[PDB]
């Protein structure tokens, strides 16, 4: 149940990195399907920190994206990787 959070790459305040992890934790408690997890996190960050955020949630992917400075995080919640970033 209690998945270990492990931050792999962050360009954001330590405040928001804790918010990300906590918000992803709530999303994984509520939803099982990766697109629904990603939607919950994206929509919460659009609210809590203003648009436009994007979120990818998965067990196997690589990515290359462009993000505003101080608005990028990539972390594992258990065995699930979460990419969350602002662009636009």
């Amino acid at each position: 149940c209690d998945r270990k959070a492990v931050i792999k790459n962050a360009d954001m305040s330590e405040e928001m990195q804790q918010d990300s992890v906590e918000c992803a934790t709530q999303a994984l408690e509520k939803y099982n399907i990766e697109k629904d997890i990603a939607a919950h996190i994206k929509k919460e960050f659009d609210k809590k920190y203003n648009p436009t955020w994007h979120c990818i949630v998965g067990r196997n992917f690589g990515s290359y994206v462009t993000h505003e400075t101080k608005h990028f995080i990539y972390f594992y919640l258990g065995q699930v990787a979460i990419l969350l970033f602002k662009s636009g």
């Binding site: 067990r59 992917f61 990515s63 290359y64 994206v65 462009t66 505003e68 990028f72 990787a81």
Partner: peptide, 10 residues
Amino acid sequence: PTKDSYTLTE
């Protein structure tokens, strides 16, 4: 002010 980033899963 923007930056490019890679990610990759284990």
